[PDB]
């Protein structure tokens, strides 16, 4: 009877091409393919039909969702995205129909990792001051459009300030997740500090942890700034 091997998860960079597998087995010289997409609505719309006959394949496309650059199959029914966007992160389904050998489905989770853009640190040149003894803020750090979500961290002078993001009188930081329209996932963090005498020469930096394909990461760490004071 046909058996239907199809990834389980395909992990790709944001922007890079990538073709997800469909492999039947037990099946006869004569055989249908059709890949669809899953709709929150549990609905699934079409993307692809193809009918293989020995080695001679007929695809068809059905695509109402729409992509830029369109879908496509390659010769043996695989699916084929170029140039992945965080868009095409989520669930393929696919179908071979074999007649009397049967019909079998099998799905894939596609991944797309997108690198968040270089990690911009925004300083507070306004207010900052040393006689004050309130938890000032001293700079804000944007990690905007990766995917997954960015994970920001912070330094005084090469060591890490290990603040939380609970609430405290002597140091914290912020946390804001943005979705973007596009389904890119933004990052900002801001970073709260008394300030004492020593700061006065301290460095500061952010850095910013996102993931990638095959359990790897990356990180960006944004300029290192020192703090304007107000007398």
Request: charged share 25%; hydrophobic share 35%; glycine share 6%.
């Amino acid at each position: 009877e046909v058996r239907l091997s199809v990834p389980p998860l395909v992990e790709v960079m944001r922007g890079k091409s990538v073709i997800l597998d469909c492999t039947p087995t037990g099946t006869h010289d004569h055989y249908m393919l059709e890949w669809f997409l899953t709709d929150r609505s549990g609905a699934r719309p079409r993307l692809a039909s193809a009918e293989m006959q020995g080695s001679e394949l007929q695809v068809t496309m059905h695509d109402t969702r729409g992509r830029s650059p369109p879908y496509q199959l390659d010769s043996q029914g695989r699916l084929v995205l170029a140039e992945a966007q965080v868009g095409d992160e989520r669930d393929y389904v696919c179908v071979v129909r074999a007649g009397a050998a049967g019909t079998a489905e099998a799905t894939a989770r596609l991944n797309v990792f997108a690198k968040p853009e270089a990690t911009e640190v925004s300083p507070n040149k306004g207010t900052l001051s040393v006689m004050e003894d309130s938890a000032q803020e001293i700079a804000t750090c944007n990690s905007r459009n990766g995917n997954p979500a960015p994970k920001i961290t912070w330094y005084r002078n090469g060591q890490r300030l290990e603040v939380p993001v609970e609430m405290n009188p002597e140091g914290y930081m912020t946390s804001r997740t943005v979705r973007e329209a596009s389904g890119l996932l933004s990052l900002t963090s801001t970073l709260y500090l008394r300030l004492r005498k020593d700061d006065r020469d301290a460095s500061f930096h952010c850095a910013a942890h996102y993931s990638l394909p095959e359990g790897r990461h990356g990180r960006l760490d944004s300029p290192t700034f020192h703090l304007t004071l107000h007398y």
